[PDB]
C-alpha cells in the first residue's frame, strides 16, 4: 500500500524537474 | 509502468525522461 504510496511522492517529483515545460501524466500502475 | 521499472529499481533522469509528455 504505502511505500508504492511513499515511492511515488518521489517520483512524481523527479517527473516535474525533469520533465519541466513538457508536463507529464502520472498513471500508476495503469 | 514507472512504479517498478523506477521504485523497486532506479532510474537516472534519462530513463525518467521517456515518461514526459
Known amino acids: ?30 | 509502468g514507472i512504479v517498478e521499472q523506477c521504485c523497486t529499481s532506479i532510474c537516472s533522469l534519462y530513463q525518467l525522461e521517456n515518461y514526459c509528455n
Not at chain 1, 504505502?2 to 501524466?25: D, K, M, P, T, W
Open chain 1, 1 to 30: 500500500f504505502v511505500n508504492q504510496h511513499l515511492c511515488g511522492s518521489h517520483l512524481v517529483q523527479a517527473l516535474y524537474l525533469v520533465c519541466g515545460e513538457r508536463g507529464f501524466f502520472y498513471t500508476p500502475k495503469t
